[PDB]
Design an enzyme around this catalytic site. Sequence first.
Site, mmCIF file in Angstrom:
data_model
loop_
_atom_site.group_PDB
_atom_site.id
_atom_site.type_symbol
_atom_site.label_atom_id
_atom_site.label_comp_id
_atom_site.label_asym_id
_atom_site.label_seq_id
_atom_site.Cartn_x
_atom_site.Cartn_y
_atom_site.Cartn_z
ATOM 1 N N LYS A 87 47.967 28.002 39.236
ATOM 2 C CA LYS A 87 49.530 28.861 40.408
ATOM 3 C C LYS A 87 49.416 29.677 39.141
ATOM 4 O O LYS A 87 50.054 31.234 39.758
ATOM 5 C CB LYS A 87 49.680 28.245 41.520
ATOM 6 N N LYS B 183 43.392 24.672 47.635
ATOM 7 C CA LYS B 183 42.927 24.041 47.849
ATOM 8 C C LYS B 183 42.816 23.395 45.965
ATOM 9 O O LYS B 183 41.886 21.965 46.365
ATOM 10 C CB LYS B 183 41.318 25.004 48.017
ATOM 11 N N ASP C 276 7.939 41.551 35.192
ATOM 12 C CA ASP C 276 8.364 42.626 35.228
ATOM 13 C C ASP C 276 8.314 43.385 33.688
ATOM 14 O O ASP C 276 7.918 43.681 32.545
ATOM 15 C CB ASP C 276 10.152 42.603 33.950
HETATM 16 K K LIG Z 1 49.474 33.999 40.368
#
Ligand SMILES: [K+]
Length: 327
Positions: A52, A64, A184
């Site tokens: 966080k 989560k 390619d």
């Molecule tokens: K933050």
Amino acid sequence: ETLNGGITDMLTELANFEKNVSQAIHKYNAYRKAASVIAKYPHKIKSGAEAKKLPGVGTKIAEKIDEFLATGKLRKLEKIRQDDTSSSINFLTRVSGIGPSAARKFVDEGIKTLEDLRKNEDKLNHHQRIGLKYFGDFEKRIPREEMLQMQDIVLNEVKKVDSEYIATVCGSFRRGAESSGDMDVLLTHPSFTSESTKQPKLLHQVVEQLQKVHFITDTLSKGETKFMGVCQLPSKNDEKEYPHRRIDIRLIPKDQYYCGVLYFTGSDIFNKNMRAHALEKGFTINEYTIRPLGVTGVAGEPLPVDSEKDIFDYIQWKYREPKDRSE
DNA sequence: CATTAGA
DNA sequence: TCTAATG
Ligand SMILES: [K+]
Ligand SMILES: [K+]
């Protein structure tokens, strides 16, 4: 790379979902920066809280993280994983020419399978019909051994048409790779550079050749500088025909060849790395040129390149064989 | 990140 | 013209 791995994997799963099944470009962009930042972080995230403190790490995500740290799972992830619609989207998306928008629409109409798709070819465009047609073959890898037989045919007609062309088959193929996904080919001509007002035929000519001989079997999209198609190695003396392969041929101003070639040869990291270095070495690299840096902050003026070498020289580095351009 | 289809 | 799909 592994200490924050689950979180990064869960997170991307989360994002990829919002992006496709939902149209949540934002949530989607959210999950990714996070996934991104959590990925750099040098320690084992022990909780949402810790996570966080990060940039991009909201309360939604930190939350989560706990559930995932706490129990080795996530319902939302479990629920989505189960979700027949969402699953359907994920699937139709494998068809070539079906992207999220068409997937959703298709589902909407109730077309959630390959077979569905069949019954309704009419609801599909040429690109999609083709992608449909070769669903299997397109998913199949290309063994180098074939890569070599395709490159071979290619360079031959190229040369047949006009001896002045220069083709290069780029990608992991060029870097060694046991197998590849598609071929390619970067093309160019002297009679075509930055200014010299095109010569659409330049591209046409060759595509036409390749076709003339059955190397090229379908056209997904043909423009004046980028042709995107499907090809097949002549099925031998029977009992074994070859899988349909995706091929891309693109015109290029002879004055931009080697940079493009440099570039498309990757690897994604080797590039990034070489590139990072040109900066120190007082330069700027990118898919088309190489410009000298000017102290004011930035600068311009494309230095002249005749080979993959010029570029090397310029940043005063060791020429790296494509083989070891891995990173 | 630019090129093509398409509607 | 925009918007989607590829790479
Ligand atoms: K933050
Ligand atoms: K697709």
